[PDB]
Every structure is written in C-alpha cells, then in structure tokens.
Amino acid sequence: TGLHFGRLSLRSLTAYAPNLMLWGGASMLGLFVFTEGWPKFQDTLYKKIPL
Amino acid sequence: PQSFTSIARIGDYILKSPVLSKLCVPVANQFINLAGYKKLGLKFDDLIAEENPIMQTALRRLPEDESYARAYRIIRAHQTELTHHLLPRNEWIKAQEDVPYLLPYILEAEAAAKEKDELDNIEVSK
Amino acid sequence: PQSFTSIARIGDYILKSPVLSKLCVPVANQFINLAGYKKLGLKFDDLIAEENPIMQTALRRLPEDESYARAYRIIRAHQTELTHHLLPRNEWIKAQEDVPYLLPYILEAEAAAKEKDELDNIEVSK
Amino acid sequence: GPPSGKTYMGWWGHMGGPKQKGITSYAVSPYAQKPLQGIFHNAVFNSFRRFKSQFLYVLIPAGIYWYWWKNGNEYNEFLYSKAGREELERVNV
Amino acid sequence: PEHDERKRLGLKTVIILSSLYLLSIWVKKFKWAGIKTRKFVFNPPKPRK
Amino acid sequence: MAFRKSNVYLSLVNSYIIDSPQPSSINYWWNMGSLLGLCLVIQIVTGIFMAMHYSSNIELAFSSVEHIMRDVHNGYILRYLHANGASFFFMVMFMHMAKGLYYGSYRSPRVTLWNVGVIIFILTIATAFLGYCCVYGQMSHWGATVITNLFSAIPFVGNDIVSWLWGGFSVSNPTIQRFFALHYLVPFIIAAMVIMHLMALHIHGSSNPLGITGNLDRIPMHSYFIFKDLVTVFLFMLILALFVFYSPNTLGHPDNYIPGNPLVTPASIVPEWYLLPFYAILRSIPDKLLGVITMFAAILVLLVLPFTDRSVVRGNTFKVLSKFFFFIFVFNFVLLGQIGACHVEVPYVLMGQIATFIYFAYFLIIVPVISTIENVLFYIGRVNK
Amino acid sequence: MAFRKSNVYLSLVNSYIIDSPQPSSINYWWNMGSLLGLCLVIQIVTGIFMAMHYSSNIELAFSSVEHIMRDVHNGYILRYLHANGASFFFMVMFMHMAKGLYYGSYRSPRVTLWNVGVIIFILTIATAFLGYCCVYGQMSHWGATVITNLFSAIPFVGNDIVSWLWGGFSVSNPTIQRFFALHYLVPFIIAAMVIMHLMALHIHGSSNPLGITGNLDRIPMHSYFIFKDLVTVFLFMLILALFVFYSPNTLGHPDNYIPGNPLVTPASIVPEWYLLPFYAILRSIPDKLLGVITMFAAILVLLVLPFTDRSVVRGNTFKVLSKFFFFIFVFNFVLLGQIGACHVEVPYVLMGQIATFIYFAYFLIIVPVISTIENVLFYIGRVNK
Amino acid sequence: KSTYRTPNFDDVLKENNDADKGRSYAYFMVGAMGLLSSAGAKSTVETFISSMTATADVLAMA
Numbered sequence A: 001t002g003l004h005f006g007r008l009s010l011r012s013l014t015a016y017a018p019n020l021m022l023w024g025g026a027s028m029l030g031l032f033v034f035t036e037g038w039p040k041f042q043d044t045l046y047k048k049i050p051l
Numbered sequence B, C: 001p002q003s004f005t006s007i008a009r010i011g012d013y014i015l016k017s018p019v020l021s022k023l024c025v026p027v028a029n030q031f032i033n034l035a036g037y038k039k040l041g042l043k044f045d046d047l048i049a050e051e052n053p054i055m056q057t058a059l060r061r062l063p064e065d066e067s068y069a070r071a072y073r074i075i076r077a078h079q080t081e082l083t084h085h086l087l088p089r090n091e092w093i094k095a096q097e098d099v100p101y102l103l104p105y106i107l108e109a110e111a112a113a114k115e116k117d118e119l120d121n122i123e124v125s126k
Numbered sequence D: 001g002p003p004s005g006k007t008y009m010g011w012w013g014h015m016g017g018p019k020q021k022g023i024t025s026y027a028v029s030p031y032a033q034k035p036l037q038g039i040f041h042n043a044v045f046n047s048f049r050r051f052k053s054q055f056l057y058v059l060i061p062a063g064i065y066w067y068w069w070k071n072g073n074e075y076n077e078f079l080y081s082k083a084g085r086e087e088l089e090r091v092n093v
Numbered sequence E: 001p002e003h004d005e006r007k008r009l010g011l012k013t014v015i016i017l018s019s020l021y022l023l024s025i026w027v028k029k030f031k032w033a034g035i036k037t038r039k040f041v042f043n044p045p046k047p048r049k
Numbered sequence F, G: 001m002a003f004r005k006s007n008v009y010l011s012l013v014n015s016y017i018i019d020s021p022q023p024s025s026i027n028y029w030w031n032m033g034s035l036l037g038l039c040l041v042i043q044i045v046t047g048i049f050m051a052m053h054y055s056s057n058i059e060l061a062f063s064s065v066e067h068i069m070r071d072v073h074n075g076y077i078l079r080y081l082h083a084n085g086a087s088f089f090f091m092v093m094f095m096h097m098a099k100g101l102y103y104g105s106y107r108s109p110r111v112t113l114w115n116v117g118v119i120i121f122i123l124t125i126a127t128a129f130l131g132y133c134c135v136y137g138q139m140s141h142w143g144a145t146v147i148t149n150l151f152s153a154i155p156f157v158g159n160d161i162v163s164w165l166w167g168g169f170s171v172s173n174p175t176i177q178r179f180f181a182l183h184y185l186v187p188f189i190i191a192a193m194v195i196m197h198l199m200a201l202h203i204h205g206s207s208n209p210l211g212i213t214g215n216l217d218r219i220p221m222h223s224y225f226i227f228k229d230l231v232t233v234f235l236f237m238l239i240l241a242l243f244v245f246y247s248p249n250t251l252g253h254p255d256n257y258i259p260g261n262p263l264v265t266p267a268s269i270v271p272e273w274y275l276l277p278f279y280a281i282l283r284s285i286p287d288k289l290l291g292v293i294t295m296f297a298a299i300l301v302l303l304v305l306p307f308t309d310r311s312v313v314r315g316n317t318f319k320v321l322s323k324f325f326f327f328i329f330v331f332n333f334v335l336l337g338q339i340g341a342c343h344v345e346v347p348y349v350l351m352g353q354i355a356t357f358i359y360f361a362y363f364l365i366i367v368p369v370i371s372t373i374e375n376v377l378f379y380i381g382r383v384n385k
Numbered sequence H: 001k002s003t004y005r006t007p008n009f010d011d012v013l014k015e016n017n018d019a020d021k022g023r024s025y026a027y028f029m030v031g032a033m034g035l036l037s038s039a040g041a042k043s044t045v046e047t048f049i050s051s052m053t054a055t056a057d058v059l060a061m062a
C-alpha cells in the first residue's frame, strides 16, 4: 500500500539508479577528456597501455 | 512549510492534556495581543499566505458573504498602515470574533491531496 | 510608395495615345517575360506587398473562391523555390490568365481614404 | 510570441484578486487642501508612538553584545600590562 | 595641495543639495495628499448572487 | 492606444517605470534598489574617466594614482567619489538584504529573485578586491598575498592554481596587469545580472510590509513613487558629498599611501570595513582548507533559507520571537567586523569562534525551531478546548 | 506546458532559438547574422586575454605587442586570430547589408530594424580605428594625425575639439592611453544594440527571397535551420584558420612593424582595406570642412532609402533594370577602395570624383526613377487597350 | 447608510480653494527643483569633460 517519496519515489530511484551510474560515467567521460594537457593530472592519464 | 494537519495534531494534543494547557495557553494568548493584528482590523486567517494551490482551492469554496467582508478588511488595513496610524479602539477585532473561518476548507483540501497522492504510488500485493 | 491611382493615371495616358503605345508596350511585354514570375505559377497581383491598411482592406472584400486559389499559388511557389527548380511548362501562367483580379478592390479603398482625408482638413467659407 | 507560465499578479483590469461588491471610496484633490498641515502632531505623536513599540526588540540585543565586547577589551588590556604578565603566560600556553 | 579649493567647492555643493532635499519633501507631501485622506465605507450586500 | 504602449522600446519603459502596479503600503525601505542602480552608474562613469590616466605596470601604478590627484583637472574629485562610492554601495546593499530577510521576500513565489541576488553579491566582493590591489600600496600587496595563498591547500591541485593566478612565483607585475583588466570586466557582468533580476520581479511584482496580497489596492509608479524616490536620492548625494569634500580619507587605511614593498611586512594587515566580518570567519578555523570553505559557505548559506522557514505567515511584522532573533543576528554581524580588525590575542580568539557559530546556527537551527513554535501558538490561542 | 515555455529565462531562448517560425524558402544569404554573432564573441574573448599583457604607455606600447608574440604562451595565436578576425567581421557585414539592399528588407514594416543596424556600423568603424592606434607603429601615428586634424576646420570651435581629443598639442601619450580605454568600452555598447536589433526582428519576423508573405508555410528553427547554420560556421572557422596559421600578415601593412616616430613621415599613408572606399570619398573634396561632412554623409545616406524606393513590389528578384544597377553600385564600391590605395596623381583624381558622385546618385536619383518606370511597365503589359 | 452622503473632509480643506493660489505654491516649488537640478547637471557634465584636457605636466612642457 505504502511507498515513500518526496516527489522522487523509492522505486523512482532504482529505475534510474543504473542510469545514475551511467551518467556518473558520462561526467567521468566528460572531464578526463577535458584536463589532459593540464600539467597536473598527467601522473595517471597516460598510464594507458599505448601512448 | 508546515501542514495545518500537523499544526492541528500538535495543538489538539496540547489542549486535551490538562497540565500542558494550563502551562502553554497563557503564553499563547499574550503572544496574540503583542502581535497586534487586531488593532489593524484583521483576523488571523487573513494573514495566511495564499500563493499555493491548497489555499487557492479553499478560497473558491468560501461563501460569497464571507468573501466580500474579507476583501474589505484587507483594504482597510493597507490604508491604515500607509498613514502610520491605528484604527479606533471601537473598531478593533474582539476575541470572540477572531474565529478560524477558513480552517475547515483547508483541512478538507489537504486530506484529499494526501489520498490522491498515496494512490499514485501504491505497492500492490499478489 | 506610389499610389495605384497615380500608376493608372500615367498608364491610361500612355495607352490612349497611339504613338506612345506603339513605342512603350513591346518594352513592357518583354519586361514581363524576363521577370519570370509566371514560371513559378504566380499572377502579378500575388506579388503586391500586403502589410498596409489599404491592401488589408482589399483582401477582405475578395470573394472566397478567388481567395482559396491565391493561397495555393503562393504555397506552391515557395515549395518550387526551396528546391531550386521550375514548374513544368504546362503549369505556367498564360498571358490571358494574368488578369488584375485585385485592382478594382484597391482603387475603391484608395478613393475612400482620400475623400475621408480631405473632409478632415476642410477650409470653410462664410 | 507564445504565452508562458502564469503568475499570481496580472495587470490593470485583470489583476487577479477576489470579486468586490459593496465598497465605496471617496477622495479630495490635493490642489484643494493645504500641504504641510500637521507634521507636528506627527513627529511627536506618531514617531514617539512607533518608537515606544519597537525599541525593546532592538536594544536588549544591543546591550548583550556591547557588554560582551567590553569585558573582552578590558581583560585584554590587563593581560598586556605589567600587572598581568603572569596571567598572560598562563593563558597563552 | 587642493585643500583650499576643495573646501570652497564643497560649500557650493552642500548648499545646493540641502535645498533640493527640502524642496523634494514639500513636493512629495503635496502630490500624496489625496491618498492619505481618502476614506472607505462598507455596506454588506445581499448574498443572492 | 498611446505611443508609450505601442512602441517596442518605450513599451518596456512604460511597463517598468510608468504604469507598473505597486502596493499602496510599501515604505521607504523599498527605495534601496533604486539607489543601488545609481551607485553602479557612479562607479562605472568615474572609473572610465580615470582609466584614461592609469598605468597598470607594477613600477608605474602607485605614481599614476598620485598623478591623477595632483596633475589631472578635478582628479581628486573622481578618486574620492569613486573610493567612497564603493563604501556607500556596500552599505545600501546590506540594508537591502536585511529588509528582504525581515519581510520574507525570499519565500515562494520569489525564490528565483533571491538567488540571482546572491550571485550579484559574490561578483561584487570580487570586483572591489581586484580594484584595491591596483593602487599597489602596502595593504594592496599583502592583502593579495594572504588570500591567493589560501588556494595552495586544495588537495594535489593547489600549487598549480596559485601559480596560474599569479603568473609566476609571487605577487608581481603579471598579477597586477591581469587584475586590472578583469576589474574593468566584472561590472558589465553585474549589469547583465541586474536585468535578469528585474525580469524575475515583473512576474509577481513586489511584496508589502504586511505579508498579504496587494492585488486589491494598487497605485501606479509614476508621480507617487517616482517623487518618493527623489527624496532618498538627494539625501544620498548630500551625505556622500560631505565625505568626498570634507572627510575623504576616514574610511581608509594610512598604510596604502606607502608604496608596496615585498620586503617589509606591515604590523597589521587589515581589510576594508565591509570585508571584515568574513575575514573573522576565516581566521577562526585553525586549518587552512576548512577555513577557505567556511568563508565561502558564509555567502551561500543564504540559499538555504527558503526551505528552513517553516511558517504559514510571510514576514516578521506580527512575530514576537522572530523579531528578537533578527536583531541578535544583526549585532552579531557587527561584532565579527570589530574582531576582524583586532590582533590575534586572548580573548578575541574565542569570541570570534562563538560568533562564527551563531552566524550559521541562525539559518540552520534557530529559524526552523521558532517558526514551528509560533505556528502552534497561533492555533491554541484561538482554538482552545 | 513544457518547462522551456514556462520558465522566465528559457521562454526567451525557446521563442528566439527553438520554436521561432521561419519562412520555408530562406536561403544561405540569411546565415550571415549568425556569423556576426560568433565574430563578436571571438574578438571580445581574444582581446580580454591580451589585455592581461598589454601596456598603453607610448614608450611601452609597441614592445608590449612584440612581448605577446615572443614570450606569451600561444600569444601569436591570440593576436593573428584577433587581427584577422576583424577583417572577417567586416566582410560578413558588407554581405549582410548588401543582401538586405537586394531583397528590400529596409522597407516597411522593418524600417526600425534597418536604423539600429546603421548605428552598429558607425560604432564598429570607431572601434577598429581605436585599436589600430594602440599598436603604435608608423601607420598608427600618422593615421590618427590625419583624421583628428580634420575637426580643426569646424567654424570657431574646431581647435578646441582637437586639443580636447588629443589631451595636448599633438598625438602623444595622453592620446594613446585614452584610446585604449574607449576601445575596450564600445564593444559592450555594440552588444546592447544587437539585443535591441533582435527585439525589432521578433515583431514581424524575417522576410524571404520572393518578397511576399510567409504566413502560409512556416518551419520551426530547431533542427532545420540550426543544422543549416553549422554548415557555414565550420566553413568560416576553416578559412580563418588558413589565414591565422599559413598567411597571417597578408591583410596588413609592413610599416606598422616600424615603431611610431613623429619625425619621419612614411611615403604612403594608407588605411586598412575596409576603410579605403570612405577614405577616397574624403580625398575627393578639395575643401577640408566639406570633405569631413561628405564622408560621414556616406554612412547616413542609407537612412534615406525607405522613402526613395517608389515600388509596389518588395525586392529585386523579379526586376530586370533594378538588378543591373545593383551590381553597378557594388563594383563602384570596389573601385573606390582601389583608388583609396593609390597616390594622388592623374588620372586617379578625377576617377574618384566621378565615382563619389555615383555612390550618392544611386540612393537619391537612380532608385526613384527606375522604380517608377518599372511600376508603369507592369501595368501596360497586362492592362493594354 | 446611503452612498450619496459624502464623509467628513473638514480636517484637511482650505481657506477657500482659490484656484488662483492653490496652483501658485505647488508650481513655485516644482520650478525651483527644476532650476537647481539643471544647474547641477551642467556642473557634473563639465567636471567630467574637463578631466580630458591637458594635464599639468603637459602644460609645463608647453
């Protein structure tokens, strides 16, 4: 009968919670493009297998 | 803001209790006299903010005769305040006239919004 | 801009005169063919600018059947022009169809605006 | 343009309040009355009346914070005198 | 080195602005006299409506 | 219809200046927004006429400002007006904000108007800071040193941010030339935020001192509130003229008439009077990183107020308890400025700590608890059984 | 309704960018206004990043620009982009204006939109002139000398205007420091005129190449004309990059790499390519006062066109005679630039006189006479008796 | 009560309205405020414009 909410229902949280992980990625994707060449983060930005 | 359903739940508990009512009511009466809204010719329900849907609903359901008087009390108070005077003491709202004339229309609109809103997020059994 | 009353006054003088008509009409015909508005399926009165009160009046007084056809010719021409093609040669406006269908409604609205305006600035005798 | 999401205030003619019936308003021209008419019976009646109401809400707070600044400034000047050098080396550690 | 000129231009500026401030108080109270003395009366209508 | 209503451009002037409906009962506290608009015009105009004679090189900067004072015709009028005009701009803004806090103007339906205002405040502290550094005296050098070295505590990334802000390894010539070009810019961004601020007011219009609707009695703006605003314009110009012409250096520090020297530290590094309460909040936090967070948090805790006021009435006019704690908060904000102008010594260390707590507890603990108590007292005084 | 339609700020974006009704038949000549908006963003951003390293003193100015080229990281990119970006801004504006002249966009109901545009053009010539003087090479000094000495011919008042413009008795240090502060300002005034320009377009919307109504077939802006505008943005950014990186000094003069010297005159004082046609109009008038009037009259004769076109049809698409004289006027405007880059010698003296006449006779004598002839030919070709 | 009865306005009314005079005093004050503010506007503009004239050091080398 009862599910709790603040306009953001508990199973309105977990029908978007995967996509939160995915858009948490979409911003991970969005800044490790943005800040290579900035001399700081270089430490672990060309740790990749090539390059 | 806080719901009038919650305000009434706390108040009724205080009032039904003998010890708490003998201890919290005189404080509340002199809080009313020090506020000074009767001296401008207003009842308390004139002061409630009206820019929200539950309160817009309550004002439509109000009878015509009570609604015309509310408009006059509000105009009279604005004019009293731009002159920086008070009204004559024979035009002050008395205690027996400061009634909650709008509270039943508010509690009815609130109870319907909660029932509708529980029904839109129900967990069903099988 | 120039009035259609003045355009008609000059034109009629040219046309009634034999020598001037034999000298100025062939120039005017080939000015029409080189313009190329028939190749898009338009009559000349479709081209007149309509954002002025005398021309808004003339379009209300136009019959319904002539008004529905005007709307279609204008839509067909916009579509022909965004594709950068011309219409088929069997859909071109012919000379006998390129009639001034809207001129009488314009000259009537212009003559009434001049009569009204003279009457608003009259010099009276005694 | 298109209409947007509407408000709690309109314009002249459709301001958006309740319907009024039974109220009458009267007024007189300013050219027909005298200005600067009573502005004593104003600064001595109403200003003193308005002051007398809203002055215990402003002055009891002001008295608590000013007393606090005092006892601190008094104590600091004692610490850095020669009679308060022993206390300074106690509290500064 | 501007001390003497500065103190003399400030006498001109303070006299002009002080009179404009008093003139503005006069003009306001005249143009507001209709609103301050306006009166209202209520006669309760019949709730037929 | 009238031309003022039909023309594209005058229609906006008419709807904002001439025919705008205003509540009949608004008082003189509603006149501060007009003054802040004249203030911004004073500063932009006086500043552009000085920029014609200013040089931003670190070896030429102090002497350019003394050249405006001695050799430029009426240049001492431009500077003192400009320098004291910024002190007046900040005082009218604190009173404008304190009003809205008293009368509940932050509440719905005007939450968007309060938030654009918080942005204007941040961009205005930034502007004034950048301009004081361009004088390049001795409070200019060591004030920029203390604030810019705060960003060297951000984890793993801090020492890259300070060297990019400086353009080198210390406050030097590249720092002073970039701070002047940014100081010219930000005033034009504040003006664009002031237009967006007015658009959000036009939707619902203004509130009034009683906290109820104003749609039953409205007065047009022209010739009731235009002439009411002249009253406060001329009082503002009078008091400002009295500082510019008769006491033009009382709202400053003498050390900034000493030229800037990296090799001699002053005995007391002190900001202007209008940044002292925020300077005391910073000094109260022993850790460097937490201090710079707590200082910026002091500006952005204002955005939390629309959700912590739990009352059904707008404003404080009829509220007894909420009046007492409004004036506690005002005089606690004046003590923070005083403590920010003192030496770091007993007992001014603990005083600024307790007062930094009271600044934050007002928005987060006091307002919710008194608002709820006041609601329930209104109920049991009328409905008693 | 949708949030983009209800919010105060996004409602303006939606009405101007997303849901705006556009005629179905507009071509790529309607894409220039978008480019002029990107141009203004390029110049303002590149200029603010250079102002961090620039010094306006006359003894420091030339060497500050060479310091941006050699010592500043990527500073050669900022300058060449900026210098060649102004040449591109002017070329897109001439094409934008020539379009409106061809399609009759000046006519009623859009007379107000044409007039705000003429203002933008004047303020844009002023901006570019002030910036070239801040380099302070040898075309910078002697170009400001020639133009500022023109105002000494105004009767009884002229020699007071030049000395107030200079700040002295010649082009000197006070002149170069005031021209830089004004050069930063005027771009922000152009931006405010661009907003007023767009407000006047929203009333009646845009025209179309046929010159008839467009209310019978409309397409929204988003995803038909947004993606049609990307096509020309990337072509603009390609051709500009080809000048910045491979030929960055072909649209300039070598003398401006010589530092400014009042004691040595160049053998040829020549403006940039985009002010040469107006420079030939000035040189064509033997008298000094009449010359400076005739030059400014060349910009403000554009305001006379809404009253001299006497035609019942909008635009030139179906007009044979009015097409021939549109292209006479365009190539007469290119000869005036060429003659403005020549020595004052036979026969370039009389050529520029006859061509200055044809510039003025087009707006005042040619358009009224051909428009009337064309109206009457349309009539007698259809109505023949 | 009838709407044809006007309420009491005798606290605020004049000697005799005397339209020759009621207009006299209001427009002397509106005229004085326009006179002083037009003079003040003219001193403000001339102060800003004169700042662009030659400085003292430039006139010393004249």
Ligand SMILES: CCCCCCCCCCC(=O)OC[C@H](COP(=O)(O)OC[C@H](O)COP(=O)(O)OC[C@@H](COC(=O)CC)OC(=O)CCC)OC(=O)CCCCCCCC
Binding pocket: B084, E025, E028, E029, F027, F028, F029, F088, F091, F092, F231, F232, F235, F236, F239
């Ligand atoms: C830095 C300079 C900036 C320039 C302007 C600053 C003005 C800010 C002052 C604060 C404010 O705006 O509120 C003031 C408030 C009274 O406002 P109210 O509408 O309730 O009362 C209308 C009046 O009765 C009718 O006033 P009336 O319109 O009839 O006459 C005008 C009056 C001029 O008063 C003013 O200019 C108001 C600022 O004429 C005279 O006083 C004659 C004597 C020469 O008074 C109070 O509630 C308490 C005032 C004391 C606290 C002030 C502390 C501020 C730091």
Ligand SMILES: CCCCCCCCCCCCCCCCCC(=O)OC[C@H](COP(=O)(O)OCCN)OC(=O)CCCCCCCCCCCCC
Binding pocket: B081, D054, D058, F029, F094, F095, F097, F098, F099, F102, F209, F210, F298, F299, F316, F317, F330, F333, F334
């Ligand atoms: C980061 C942002 C932080 C900002 C912190 C803000 C601190 C800035 C300090 C500014 C001081 C201004 C305080 C007054 C606030 C303005 C609003 C106000 O106080 O309301 C006026 C009120 C009117 O009286 P009523 O309650 O009767 O309501 C009107 C009738 N319907 O009447 C009153 O309430 C009393 C008015 C008297 C005001 C003077 C009291 C303060 C005196 C010293 C203050 C020192 C400041 C330097």
Ligand code: HEM
Binding pocket: F040, F043, F044, F047, F048, F049, F050, F051, F054, F065, F079, F082, F083, F086, F089, F127, F128, F129, F131, F132, F134, F135, F183, F184, F187
């Ligand atoms: C919101 C607007 C502005 C504020 C609040 C502001 C603030 C300040 C402050 C506090 C100072 C230091 C005063 C001192 O000398 O003690 C200053 C200095 C200065 N400002 Fe501004 N400013 C503003 C706008 C401008 C603009 C737009 C310009 C340039 C066009 C400008 C140019 C200058 C200059 C040249 C100085 C040098 C020092 C001086 O002349 O006093 N200011 N500014």
Ligand code: HEM
Binding pocket: F029, F030, F031, F032, F033, F034, F036, F037, F093, F096, F097, F100, F103, F105, F106, F110, F113, F114, F117, F118, F120, F121, F194, F197, F201, F205, F206, F207, F208
């Ligand atoms: C700095 C430039 C500012 C300008 C030019 C400006 C302008 C104005 C004006 C003209 C008004 C209407 C009149 C009035 O209520 O006084 C107003 C109202 C308001 N302002 Fe500002 N303001 C500025 C800054 C701020 C700031 C910093 C805040 C808050 C942090 C703010 C919040 C508000 C609010 C809430 C109102 C509505 C008050 C009400 O209707 O009761 N403004 N502003």
Ligand code: HEM
Binding pocket: G040, G043, G044, G047, G048, G049, G050, G051, G054, G065, G079, G082, G083, G086, G089, G127, G128, G129, G131, G132, G134, G135, G183, G184, G187
């Ligand atoms: C409509 C916008 C602008 C236009 C059309 C424009 C035009 C010009 C031109 C033609 C030059 C000379 C180019 C050369 O070196 O040969 C120049 C130089 C310069 N401009 Fe601008 N400008 C604009 C905006 C700005 C702004 C907003 C600033 C400052 C924030 C600025 C700062 C400079 C500087 C510092 C120079 C020095 C010389 C150089 O670096 O090339 N410009 N400008």
Ligand code: HEM
Binding pocket: G029, G030, G031, G032, G033, G034, G036, G037, G040, G093, G096, G097, G100, G103, G105, G106, G110, G113, G114, G117, G118, G120, G121, G194, G197, G201, G205, G206, G207, G208
């Ligand atoms: C910074 C300079 C300018 C900007 C950013 C700008 C922007 C725009 C934009 C976005 C449009 C939309 C339709 C179109 O692209 O044709 C437009 C139209 C127009 N502009 Fe501009 N413009 C500028 C300068 C000018 C100038 C200098 C003129 C004329 C002297 C002018 C006159 C017009 C006219 C008449 C139209 C309407 C054309 C039509 O609808 O057929 N504009 N402008």
Ligand SMILES: COc1c(O)c(C)c(C/C=C(/C)CC/C=C(\C)CC/C=C(/C)CC/C=C(/C)CC/C=C(\C)CCC=C(C)C)c(O)c1OC
Binding pocket: G015, G016, G017, G020, G033, G034, G036, G037, G038, G040, G041, G044, G045, G048, G049, G191, G194, G198, G206
């Ligand atoms: C037919 O209909 C159309 C239409 O076709 C088009 C294309 C557009 C879009 C075209 C336009 C021209 C509008 C674009 C707007 C402008 C050109 C005005 C730009 C105004 C400015 C003030 C630009 C300034 C830009 C900045 C980035 C200033 C800030 C500077 C910074 C961040 C650099 C300095 C910062 C640091 C930290 C050093 C329309 O709006 C439109 O209307 C319906």
Ligand SMILES: COc1c(O)c(C)c(C/C=C(\C)CC/C=C(\C)CC/C=C(/C)CC/C=C(/C)CC/C=C(\C)CCC=C(C)C)c(O)c1OC
Binding pocket: F016, F017, F033, F034, F035, F036, F037, F038, F040, F041, F042, F044, F045, F048, F191, F194, F195, F198, F201, G182, G189
């Ligand atoms: C509630 O109703 C109100 C209201 O009460 C008020 C008071 C206002 C009034 C205004 C404001 C509150 C603020 C708005 C102000 C701005 C956006 C300010 C813009 C500021 C500027 C300083 C622009 C300056 C531009 C210039 C070109 C001048 C600079 C330099 C010059 C002239 C030197 C060059 C000179 C020569 C000779 C070369 C309203 O608009 C309003 O409507 C809502």
Ligand SMILES: CCCCCCCCCCCCCCC(=O)O[C@H](COC(=O)CCCCCCCCCCCC)COP(=O)(O)O
Binding pocket: G017, G034, G223, G225, G226, G229, G230, G233
């Ligand atoms: C404003 C006047 C027009 C001038 C041209 C405007 C240029 C800037 C806007 C760029 C178009 C973005 C719209 C895409 C969209 O929302 O639809 C998105 C597409 O987004 C995507 O996933 C594809 C990536 C977008 C490609 C971006 C291309 C260039 C971006 C800028 C280049 C630098 C200037 C689809 O959703 P929709 O169909 O409902 O609109």
Ligand SMILES: CCCCCCCCCCCCCCC(=O)O[C@H](COC(=O)CCCCCCCCCCCC)COP(=O)(O)O
Binding pocket: F017, F034, F225, F226, F229, F230, F233, H027, H030, H031, H033, H034, H037
């Ligand atoms: C929104 C901001 C509110 C404050 C705005 C203040 C701006 C001042 C404009 C006042 C215009 C009054 C309308 C004129 C009129 O009705 O007829 C005027 C009446 O007013 C005047 O004579 C001028 C009086 C005051 C001088 C105006 C400038 C004040 C100082 C400006 C300081 C900079 C802000 C004509 O006189 P008459 O009606 O008797 O024929």
Ligand SMILES: CCCCCCCCCCCCCCCCCC(=O)O[C@H](COC(=O)CCCCCC)COP(=O)(O)OCCN
Binding pocket: F006, F007, F008, F009, F010, F012, F013, G111, G112, G115, G116, G192, G193, G195, G196, G203
């Ligand atoms: C840009 C900042 C963002 C906010 C918007 C700014 C709005 C404030 C503008 C201030 C008012 C300006 C006064 C305009 C005077 C009346 C204009 C007019 O007569 O319209 C035109 C003529 O205007 C012009 O030719 C050029 C005006 C350029 C003005 C440059 C300042 C009259 O034509 P019409 O009778 O058809 O009125 C327009 C009907 N929509």
Ligand SMILES: CCCCCCCCCCCCCCCCCC(=O)O[C@H](COC(=O)CCCCCC)COP(=O)(O)OCCN
Binding pocket: D005, F111, F112, F115, F116, F192, F195, F196, G003, G006, G007, G008, G009, G010, G012, G013, G195
């Ligand atoms: C012409 C010059 C000036 C005018 C500029 C107009 C064009 C500017 C484009 C602005 C981009 C969009 C800005 C944010 C849009 C969302 C606003 C919003 O959600 O409103 C508020 C949030 O309040 C804010 O914090 C405003 C921050 C403003 C940010 C300053 C850039 C909530 O949305 P709200 O309920 O008010 O919308 C009503 C529709 N139901």
Ligand SMILES: CCCCCCCCCCCCCC(=O)O[C@H](COC(=O)CCCCCCCCCCC)COP(=O)(O)O
Binding pocket: E009, E012, E013, E016, E017, F042, F045, F077, F237, F238, F240, F241, F244, H037, H039, H040, H041, H042, H043, H044, H047
């Ligand atoms: C835009 C700046 C306004 C700042 C006002 C603040 C008060 C300080 C005044 C400093 C003014 C400098 C000029 C001066 O000293 O003049 C002085 C005269 O004093 C005045 O009249 C006061 C002027 C202010 C009245 C309001 C004018 C309205 C604004 C006009 C905008 C078009 C001396 O000038 P003088 O050369 O002797 O003629």
Ligand SMILES: COC(=O)N(OC)c1ccccc1COc1ccn(-c2ccc(Cl)cc2)n1
Binding pocket: F125, F126, F128, F129, F130, F132, F133, F139, F140, F142, F143, F144, F146, F147, F269, F270, F271, F272, F275, F278, F279
């Ligand atoms: C008017 O100028 C001064 O008083 N300055 O700066 C030279 C000064 C002078 C001496 C000592 C300290 C300062 C600085 O004090 C403060 C306190 C807070 N901020 C700040 C600055 C930027 C931003 Cl975004 C947010 C907060 N600055």
Ligand SMILES: COC(=O)N(OC)c1ccccc1COc1ccn(-c2ccc(Cl)cc2)n1
Binding pocket: G125, G126, G128, G129, G130, G132, G133, G139, G140, G142, G143, G144, G146, G147, G269, G270, G271, G272, G275, G278, G279
């Ligand atoms: C880009 O800069 C140059 O080409 N400049 O200026 C240093 C130059 C260089 C050498 C020779 C001549 C000039 C000037 O040529 C012109 C011709 C007309 N204007 C003008 C200026 C302002 C205004 Cl409002 C209206 C018209 N200027």
